[PDB]
Structure of Early growth response protein 1:
Amino acid sequence: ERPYACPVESCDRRFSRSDELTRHIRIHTGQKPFQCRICMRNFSRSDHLTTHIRTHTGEKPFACDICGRKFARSDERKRHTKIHLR
DNA sequence: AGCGTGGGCGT
DNA sequence: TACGCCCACGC
Ligand SMILES: [Zn+2]
Ligand SMILES: [Zn+2]
Ligand SMILES: [Zn+2]
């Protein structure tokens, strides 16, 4: 499977979904359609723009279950929680 | 630590 | 196709 192959020369990436290839090809086109209004930096992806903006606002939605420490991203919290192991 | 950013995916 | 999650890697 993975019928959607990248057609850029030296690239061998292949994908299961059409939209995956369309997203991937932005690495080659350099297209960064999503701009931060605060610092004007451009981003390849809407979801990464959203987490980037928390760097300006200080928004930290994700609290550790053990100690309550807050993080901008779920994966930051995930990396953190395991420090509480023995 | 703080966070850029691609892949896989559900919707 | 978009939107926005988790996941993972990288610095
Ligand atoms: Zn490619
Ligand atoms: Zn910004
Ligand atoms: Zn904690």
About this structure: The pocket of zinc ion (ligand 2) is lined by residues A 36, 38-39, 41, 52, 56 (CB under 6 Å).
